[PDB]
Amino acid sequence: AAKDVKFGNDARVKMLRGVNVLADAVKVTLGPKGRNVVLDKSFGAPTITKDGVSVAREIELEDKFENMGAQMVKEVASKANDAAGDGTTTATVLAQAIITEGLKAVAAGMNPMDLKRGIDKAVTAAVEELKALSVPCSDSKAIAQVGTISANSDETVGKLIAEAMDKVGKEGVITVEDGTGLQDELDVVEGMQFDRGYLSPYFINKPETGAVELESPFILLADKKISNIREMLPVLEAVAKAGKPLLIIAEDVEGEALATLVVNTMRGIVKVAAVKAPGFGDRRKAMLQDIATLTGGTVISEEIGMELEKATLEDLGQAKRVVINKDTTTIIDGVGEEAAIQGRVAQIRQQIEEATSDYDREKLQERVAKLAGGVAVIKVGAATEVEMKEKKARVEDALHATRAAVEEGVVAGGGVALIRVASKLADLRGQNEDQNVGIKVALRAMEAPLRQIVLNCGEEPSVVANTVKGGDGNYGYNAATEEYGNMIDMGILDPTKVTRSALQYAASVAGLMITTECMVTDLP
Amino acid sequence: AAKDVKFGNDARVKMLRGVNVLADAVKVTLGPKGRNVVLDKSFGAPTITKDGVSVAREIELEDKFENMGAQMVKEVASKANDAAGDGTTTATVLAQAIITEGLKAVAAGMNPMDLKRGIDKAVTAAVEELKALSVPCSDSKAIAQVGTISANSDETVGKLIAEAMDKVGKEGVITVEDGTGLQDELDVVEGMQFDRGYLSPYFINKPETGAVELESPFILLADKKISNIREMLPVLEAVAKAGKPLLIIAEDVEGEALATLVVNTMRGIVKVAAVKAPGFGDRRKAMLQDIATLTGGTVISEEIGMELEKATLEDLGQAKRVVINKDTTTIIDGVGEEAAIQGRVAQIRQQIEEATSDYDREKLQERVAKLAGGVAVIKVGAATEVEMKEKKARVEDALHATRAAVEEGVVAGGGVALIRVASKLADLRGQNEDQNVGIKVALRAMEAPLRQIVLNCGEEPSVVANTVKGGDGNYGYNAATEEYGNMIDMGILDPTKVTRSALQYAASVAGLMITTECMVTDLP
Amino acid sequence: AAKDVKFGNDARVKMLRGVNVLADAVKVTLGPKGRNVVLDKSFGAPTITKDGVSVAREIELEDKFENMGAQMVKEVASKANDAAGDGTTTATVLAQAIITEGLKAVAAGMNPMDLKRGIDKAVTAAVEELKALSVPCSDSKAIAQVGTISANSDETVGKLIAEAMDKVGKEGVITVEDGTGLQDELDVVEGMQFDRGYLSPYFINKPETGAVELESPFILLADKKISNIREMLPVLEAVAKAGKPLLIIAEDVEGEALATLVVNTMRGIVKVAAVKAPGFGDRRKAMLQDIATLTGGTVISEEIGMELEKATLEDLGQAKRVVINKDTTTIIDGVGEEAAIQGRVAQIRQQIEEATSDYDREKLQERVAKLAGGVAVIKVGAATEVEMKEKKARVEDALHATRAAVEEGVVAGGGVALIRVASKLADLRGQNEDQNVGIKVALRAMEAPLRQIVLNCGEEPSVVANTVKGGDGNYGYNAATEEYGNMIDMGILDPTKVTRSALQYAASVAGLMITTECMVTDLP
Ligand SMILES: Nc1ncnc2c1ncn2[C@@H]1O[C@H](COP(=O)(O)OP(=O)(O)OP(=O)(O)O)[C@@H](O)[C@H]1O
Ligand SMILES: Nc1ncnc2c1ncn2[C@@H]1O[C@H](COP(=O)(O)OP(=O)(O)OP(=O)(O)O)[C@@H](O)[C@H]1O
Ligand SMILES: Nc1ncnc2c1ncn2[C@@H]1O[C@H](COP(=O)(O)OP(=O)(O)OP(=O)(O)O)[C@@H](O)[C@H]1O
Ligand SMILES: [K+]
Ligand SMILES: [K+]
Ligand SMILES: [K+]
Ligand SMILES: [Mg+2]
Ligand SMILES: [Mg+2]
Ligand SMILES: [Mg+2]
């Protein structure tokens, strides 16, 4: 279609105005005294959120050039959310400050490319300084503090996330889901448990609980669908001779084979239960091999070479306990070699490193959590769905922040880390004066998060920023209590990964944005 | 016509928005780093001004409630200009700050009447504290500093005004008018000189200069129009017998009498000049009596009792020198009793105290300046008419500020005096908590002038305000040099009358404005 | 009415856009290769002009803020036209360059007041440097060159103006009026000649020419209206006894006195002519006294003291020749004392110095030209009225430029003088860096006239400006021939007053304009 074209100051002013609209919508949420934003939904009730990425995503402007600026700056929050799952508001505030100061420098006649180069150099040095300033976050107290800060000073969320991390260890997988009550609950499942119930309700050994309970049972892992009993007959004879129970994880058991297994279960000759193999094609075999390694057994398939008829007792896996319910099956203390389990876990880790998808890598992380460590589910407790959504967003932010803190350490919160980093970079210089001004605007923008936090408290950002800059180390401003002190001591910890990602993404987008001389958009 | 009626928060928000429009237009001019405002004129070129009263006068808003707020707050600048001729921008900034904080308090549910009472109490205490803090401004250096500060750091204007004040003394009258050259000129006329030229060009004793020059002449003061020579004949005979020149200040000389005076002037029998009596009905007699007192003579009139025929040499006044030009007549060193001159000056001062009009009181002040002291005219030098208007406005501001400083003393400039006064009133309390909040909002608004001055410099108002508050006495912030120091030492002096008037008028208007619950205006 | 208020960058951009509209309309006329502008007239034919003041006056913009900028910058051209009668386009180009560079500096964050101070300091130093660089323009060749350059390389206009200046001398008065033919004519009248014809056609001594010619006649100067012959009778008897002719310059001769003068003229007893006294009340007496001084006579009036009855031959004036036509009367070689004539001329010069009106001062300048020197009229020759208007404007520009060159000297034309002055001011510095930038923008704007002259030629302004700057002295660029050389040698002379006035007025308006932060205008 026909295009509206704007140049120089007018285009830059409109882009800055759109950026300011989005950033003003987002910055009101920053900090302990940050407020909430209501986002209208065409289908459903409005959403109340403190997450700056949601606010940024909902922002779209009528003016095409202002909307261009808003959409360009929305990428900062989107990338911060995709990478660190937190710091999106800080990223947006940083991007807005960089854009404002860089456009001021451009209006002063300096070369925008050199300003962008100076910003990039300052941010690279800043990332190095943040890495130097980061301290490890390994104790449960620090993890709880990080979760509490990320959950908007919600101590319960931080304590729950720290407890979940302790229960599931380093290799465990933690997810957040909706709850039914008003209180947040933590459900931790250890060892292996897959969402595959019994193939027949008649298998239930314990009627009062409706769950098959097998003590020290054999494990028959079949990678092929089973419909007849001829293939499985010798295994059943061997199991009955042994006298121990049997659990058959198969692709599908149905028809005559299921029926005769049921009759044999009541007749007491063999206490046998059958469950479906978890997963689907090209992934079900992986879980079957994982269960075989955990239980010290072997998978029966056409591709591997042997058939179910020739399966023996040594072929079958071994486990201390097995519990089957209507939906899930749990194998407790599988009798398998620890070295093989560790090797398979390392192989899955290597595939995760080779993985290029978030969903896939999460699936193999869950597989690792089943093989070693545990799986935790945090059920968010709330009275209404709007409160559920807000609290779940905060809990997800806290979970992401705790993971980032465990991975890359922690720094002083409340924008103090960026203050200290910018103070450490006062002597940084570029190739020319324009690059020096770019470095200076990056350093000044590094103070924007603390200033916005203070402004959201109703205090004077300049006075508090000067007081924090006059301090050293982890000295800073507790905005919740409006008091100065050591941010590590008061538990205001920011994940180093979150701060670094916010700075990097804001810098990239804003440095590209300050170099713009012409905008081309659709005519109104 | 039909009326739009608004209540409570909506009306107050619209009023505050209009106030903010006017105050934002006006505050950009505040301080040494204040900028200029262009005001469009329907007939003529646009006017560039730094005077906040002009900007406030030009402001009128489309929205009727916003316009109501703007018009109400315009009264602050108008009253400051009418009273002190300076501080209108400071008055407007103070009024805006009081309105903003008082509306914040009203939105918090406190009684607006009690807030207004607290504001009034705080401002009364503030005026008392300003009176206590004021130091006399009598030396020429302090007067020049006040004029320089009021003229936007124009040292030449301050020095010129100090020189004019020194030349014309305490009782002299100084006016400002347009000039012809590019430089500001000072024209000081001492003793008595009235804008009445000779009644005939033939009276000129000195053709090379075109001015009658009479050395030790007699003075004939006639309060009646003269057309014949019979009434004036014996006076002419006595003057010719004496041999000294004669100057006739009359209501009007014309016809035969003027002709025979002309012939006698060339014939050398009597060197006589005739001029019109300055002023008009009920005021010309006053100037005639003033000249009679100065020259030790008597006025001839029908009402007093004697006629011109019976006038003698003792009736005539005496002066050392008389110079008549085409437009003005000057009497130098009139031979009159000093005690009578002082008594007449005191009588005119008493009438000035009894006077209730600015134009009238200025007229008798000019009469006093003719009788004693001098009259100074400052011709503003500029290249163009727009520059002439701007510089003349600045020079008028400096003249008003110097007069106010002479009258009521000086305090630290740059909003420092209000800072110190507000600090001295921290313990002030009202009858109830709402009055205490009113006192607090008045004290906080007292910091608005310094904060706006700093903001106009591009610096951080909060940091500089805190630094100034941490100081004591005349410690403050030179915004021109952006350095801290003693404002009296650096010559940043504010007239105490100007600061007090700004505070009082802002307080009155803003305290009345924060009490408004309903607005009634015309429908759009 | 309701007001539209704009702030900062938006207001400044609109003001600059309006300034650019006016300056783009005006700059196309600059220089020898400047084109013409057509200005529409509501009543009458369109006007084709090269004068930048006319173009600036006709400019008015729909957008109120753009119109504000245009009206403000129009003052530069108006003031240059009022002061020097030339250089209005140069003044406008200078003002536009200063505004553009100063707004660039303001957008860079420097203090506009300090930029204005730096501009003013640079322009004061520039005026001093122009005074130093100026050389006197006294020879007829230089005057003709100045007139030719000012008349857009019209050699005939320059030669005619030089001839008029030579004929009327220093004290003569030159005016420009419409002609009847296609060629420019010069009519020079020496001695005294006033536009007052004979009071009766019967006075004509020479019927073939219709003009009274009196050889060595007496001069009777009467300041009163004459209607009877009794008052004038003894003068007539004395004149008839002497036998020489008589010319009566009177307020009015009519009725019986005129009739008997007519009869006596034909009867040959006395060859007498009567003319009306030139001028009106309070000015006719001045011309009568001038004629009396020139002819060595005395004016008869009631105020002076003597009557027409007592007038004698010695009272009457004397002249060598008198020529009366239907409209004008000329007195050739009046027999009067040279010292008295010089004294009266000096007195009129003193009144001119005391005069404060252009029309009045021109009237007394014409009186001086009648008393001493001569009066020249340049009748502009053109085929049509549009060509007449254009050529008359050019001739008026040339006359003003020649007067300015005679008064204050000449400098190198084509913007070279401003180039050299700016080069001489490279070391000039202000109090702070912002004042230094103001000085720099003034110096850069000093190159705008030459650059615009070159651009109007279709050449590269930057290359030619660099070449001229690389030269020294009067080296520069002849744009008419597009060749480099000595501008004085090629006759491209600019009056120093014109260049200085253009720079000063442009500087004042533009320095005030760059300090503007807010504009208030009427809503659309
Ligand atoms: N009590 C506190 N005192 C000072 N700063 C605090 C306090 N609590 C949290 N902060 C700071 O507030 C910031 C976190 O604010 P917030 O969670 O609103 O935004 P975010 O992390 O940038 O983004 P998101 O909207 O994605 O959660 C961090 O810089 C953190 O250090
Ligand atoms: N160099 C300076 N440093 C600090 N403050 C200064 C300086 N020069 C002037 N001021 C302050 O600026 C104020 C005067 O500013 P300005 O003249 O713009 O406004 P005003 O007096 O309120 O009103 P008006 O518009 O009627 O002149 C005073 O408070 C004065 O003390
Ligand atoms: N042949 C030439 N070569 C170079 N410069 C020239 C030449 N002739 C004239 N100029 C220059 O052109 C300028 C005069 O141009 P112009 O008459 O169009 O404008 P102006 O004097 O600024 O204003 P106005 O419109 O009032 O006449 C002067 O600077 C003069 O020196
Ligand atoms: K947030
Ligand atoms: K002001
Ligand atoms: K021109
Ligand atoms: Mg967060
Ligand atoms: Mg002032
Ligand atoms: Mg010209």
**Burial class, C359, CB count within 10 angstroms (exposed 0-12 / middle 13-18 / buried 19+):** exposed
CB distance C323 to C275 below 8 Å: no
**Burial class, B7, CB count within 10 angstroms (exposed 0-12 / middle 13-18 / buried 19+):** exposed
CB distance C344 to C171 below 8 Å: no
Q: What angle do CA C50, C56, C61 make, to 5 degrees?
A: 135
CB distance B263 to B269 below 8 Å: no
Q: How far is CA B143 from the centre of its chain?
A: 15
Q: What are phi and psi of B25, to 5 degrees?
A: -65, -35
Ligand 3 atom with the smallest distance to the CA of C85 is: 26
Ligand-binding annotation for B209, yes or no, is: no
Any CB–CB contact under 8 A between C108 and chain A?
Answer: yes
Dihedral, CA of residue C155, residue C157, residue C161 and residue C163, to nearest 10 = 60
Any CB–CB contact under 8 A between C433 and chain A?
Answer: no
**Alpha-carbon distance B29 to B38, whole Å?**
11
Domain residue extents for chain C: 1-134+410-524, 135-190+372-409, 191-371
- Mutation site for C-interface testing, chosen from B202, B261, B384 by largest number of C Cβ within 10 Å: B384
All chains having 3 or more CB pairs closer than 8 angstroms to chain B: A, C
Where do the H-state alpha helices sit in B138-219?
140-150, 155-168
3-state SS, C427-493, equals CCCCCCHHHHHHHHHHHHHCCHHHHHHHHHCCCCHHHHHHHHHHCCCCEEEECCCCEEEECCCCCCE
3-state SS, B465-521, equals HHHHHHCCCCEEEECCCCEEEECCCCCCEEEHHHHHHHHHHHHHHHHHHCCCCEEEE
- Mutation site for C-interface testing, chosen from A7, A9, A111 by largest number of C Cβ within 10 Å: A9
Task: Return the residue of B nearest to A461 by Cα.
Answer: B462
C414 close to ligand 3 (CB < 6 Angstrom)? yes
Any CB–CB contact under 8 A between C310 and chain B?
Answer: no
Contacts of B466 in chain A (CB under 8 A): 463
SS3 of residue C317 by DSSP: strand
Q: How many residues does chain B have?
A: 524
Beta strands in C166-271 (DSSP E): 173-178, 185-190, 192-194, 212-215, 218-222, 246-250
Q: What are phi and psi of A155, to 5 degrees?
A: -65, -35
**Alpha-carbon distance B247 to B408, whole Å?**
43
**Ligand 8 centroid from CA B87, angstroms:** 5
Using CB atoms, which residue from C15, C75, C515 is nearest to B45?
C75
Task: Return the residue of B nearest to C7 by Cα.
Answer: B25
CB distance B121 to B444 below 8 Å: no
Contacts of A109 in chain C (CB under 8 A): 104, 108
Contacts of A463 in chain B (CB under 8 A): 462-463, 466
DSSP output for C376-440:
EEEEE--SSHHHHHHHHHHHHHHHHHHHHHHHH-EEETTTHHHHHHHHHTTT---SSHHHHHHHH
CB distance A475 to A468 below 8 Å: yes
Instruction: Tell which one of C492, C493, C496, C505 to mutate to probe ligand 3, the residue whose CB is within 8 A of the most ligand atoms.
Output: C492
DSSP output for B384-440:
SHHHHHHHHHHHHHHHHHHHHHHHH-EEETTTHHHHHHHHHTTT---SSHHHHHHHH
Q: What angle do CA C7, C11, C17 make, to 5 degrees?
A: 170
CA B181 vs CA B184, B384, C83: distances in Å? 8, 10, 12
The resolution, in angstroms to one decimal, equals 2.3
**Burial class, A42, CB count within 10 angstroms (exposed 0-12 / middle 13-18 / buried 19+):** exposed
- Torsion sign (Cα): C455, C460, C466, C471: negative
Contacts of A447 in chain B (CB under 8 A): none
Ligand-binding annotation for B29, yes or no, is: yes
Give, using CA atoms, the residue closest to atom 7 of ligand 1.
Answer: A32
The experimental technique used to determine this model is cryo-EM
Q: What angle do CA A395, A397, A399 make, to 5 degrees?
A: 70
Structure-token pair, residue A144: 């709880």
Where do the H-state alpha helices sit in B231-307?
233-242, 256-267, 284-295
Query: Which is nearest to C401 in space by CA: C130, C110, C162?
Result: C162
Query: Which is nearest to C177 in space by CA: C402, C395, C363?
Result: C395
**Alpha-carbon distance C271 to C265, whole Å?**
5
SS3 of residue C138 by DSSP: coil
Structure-token pair, residue C318: 């004397």
**Bridge pairing between strands C192-194 and C329-334:** antiparallel
Any CB–CB contact under 8 A between A342 and chain C?
Answer: no
Report the CATH architecture of B135-190+372-409: 2-Layer Sandwich (3.30)
CB distance A376 to A103 below 8 Å: no
DSSP output for B50-101:
--HHHHHHH---SSHHHHHHHHHHHHHHHHHHHHTSS-HHHHHHHHHHHHHH
Q: What are phi and psi of A396, to 5 degrees?
A: -65, -40
Q: How far is CA C102 from the centre of its chain?
A: 33
Using CB atoms, which residue from C111, C112, C516 is nearest to B37?
C516
Which residues 366-385 of chain B have a CB within 8 Å of chain C? Answer: 382-385
CB distance B445 to B118 below 8 Å: no
CA of A105, closest CA in chain B: separation in Å?
Answer: 15
- Torsion sign (Cα): C457, C460, C464, C469: positive
Say which DSSP state C203 is in.
Answer: G
**Burial class, A358, CB count within 10 angstroms (exposed 0-12 / middle 13-18 / buried 19+):** exposed
Task: Return the residue of B nearest to A466 by Cα.
Answer: B463
Q: How far is CA A6 from the centre of its chain?
A: 41
Query: Which DSSP helix (H) or strand (E) runs through B457?
Result: none
**Alpha-carbon distance B139 to B187, whole Å?**
21
In this complex, do A109 and C109 lie within 8 Å of one another by their Cβ atoms?
no
**Alpha-carbon distance B345 to B352, whole Å?**
10
CB distance B399 to B135 below 8 Å: no
Type of residue at A172: G
Contacts of C107 in chain A (CB under 8 A): 9, 107-108
Helix, strand, coil shares of chain C, percent, nearest 5, are 50, 20, 30
Beta strands in A284-363 (DSSP E): 299-300, 317-324, 329-334
**Alpha-carbon distance C49 to C45, whole Å?**
13
SS3 of residue A243 by DSSP: coil
Instruction: Tell which one of C153, C453, C477, C493 to mutate to probe ligand 3, the residue whose CB is within 8 A of the most ligand atoms.
Output: C453
**Ligand 6 centroid from CA C105, angstroms:** 28
CA C288 vs CA C300, C325, C387: distances in Å? 10, 19, 40
Residues 6+ apart with CB under 8 A from A448: A93, A94, A96, A97, A415
**Alpha-carbon distance B345 to B348, whole Å?**
5
**Alpha-carbon distance B174 to B188, whole Å?**
9
Residues 6+ apart with CB under 8 A from C411: C130, C133, C134, C135, C417, C493, C494, C495, C496, C499
Instruction: Tell which one of C22, C39, C51, C90 to mutate to probe ligand 3, the residue whose CB is within 8 A of the most ligand atoms.
Output: C90
Any CB–CB contact under 8 A between A13 and chain C?
Answer: yes
Query: Which is nearest to C50 in space by CA: C398, C380, C381?
Result: C398
Q: In this structure, which residues have their CB less than 5 angstroms from ion ligand 7? A: A 86, 397
Using CB atoms, which residue from C15, C351, C517 is nearest to B28?
C517
CB distance B437 to B110 below 8 Å: yes
In this complex, do C305 and B208 lie within 8 Å of one another by their Cβ atoms?
no
Residues 6+ apart with CB under 8 A from A28: A34, A35, A37, A456
SS3 of residue A6 by DSSP: strand
CA of A37, closest CA in chain B: separation in Å?
Answer: 22
- Mutation site for A-interface testing, chosen from B104, B463, B468 by largest number of A Cβ within 10 Å: B463
CB distance C238 to C312 below 8 Å: yes
CB distance A81 to A88 below 8 Å: yes
Task: State which fold the B191-371 domain adopts.
Answer: GroEL (3.50.7)
C120 close to ligand 3 (CB < 6 Angstrom)? no
Looking at domain B1-134+410-524, does it have CATH number 1.10.560.10?
Answer: yes
3-state SS, B350-382, equals HHHHHCCCHHHHHHHHHHHHHHCCEEEEEEECC
A102 close to ligand 1 (CB < 6 Angstrom)? no
Q: How many residues does chain A have?
A: 524
